[PDB]
From a paper:
The protective activity of E. faecium growth media was protease sensitive, which led to the proteomic analysis of the supernatant and discovery of secreted antigen A (SagA) as one of the most abundant E. faecium secreted proteins. SagA encodes an N-terminal signal sequence, predicted coiled-coil domain, Ser/Thr-rich linker region and C-terminal NlpC/p60-family peptidase domain. The identity of GlcNAc-MDP was further confirmed by LC-MS/MS analysis and its fragmentation into MDP. These results demonstrated that SagA-NlpC/p60 encodes cysteine endopeptidase activity that prefers crosslinked peptidoglycan fragments and cleaves the peptide bond between D-iGln and L-Lys. Collectively, our results suggest that E. faecium and its secreted peptidoglycan hydrolase SagA generates small muropeptides that activate NOD2, which triggers downstream signaling pathways to enhance intestinal barrier function and host immunity.
Residue numbers in the entry: 414 to 530
The structure:
């Protein structure tokens, strides 16, 4: 149950199309994807939407994010996006209604804070 396992589970759903409110491999939104990964690996249910997922661990800087941690866009209480940290400025996410689950870099779109799990 290390972050490597979270990353390995998240990689299984690359190419899953975006579906608003989707919570399973037929379609994910940003929060549904992270919730599903953590449900598969740990069995516990972090929030179904973005803001409850801000409580699942301890807040931390994006620099101090290891593989498996959660990354949040927006301010605490008003986060609008989440991804799973891959380490080294990389993450994996359900990006937006346009796109399917894919990898991304903080050099493209930088998250605002992170959460250790």
């Amino acid at each position: 149950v290390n972050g490597a396992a979270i990353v390995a589970e998240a990689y299984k759903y690359i190419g899953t199309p975006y579906v608003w409110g989707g919570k399973d491999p037929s379609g994910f939104d940003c929060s549904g994807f992270t919730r599903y990964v953590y449900l598969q690996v740990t069995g516990r249910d972090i929030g179904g939407w973005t803001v409850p997922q801000e409580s699942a661990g301890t807040k931390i800087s994006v620099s101090q994010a290891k593989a498996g941690d959660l990354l949040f866009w927006g301010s605490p209480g008003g986060t609008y996006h989440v991804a799973i940290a891959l380490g080294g400025g990389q993450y994996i996410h359900a990006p937006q209604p346009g796109e399917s689950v894919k990898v991304g870099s903080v050099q493209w779109f930088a998250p605002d804070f992170a959460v250790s799990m």
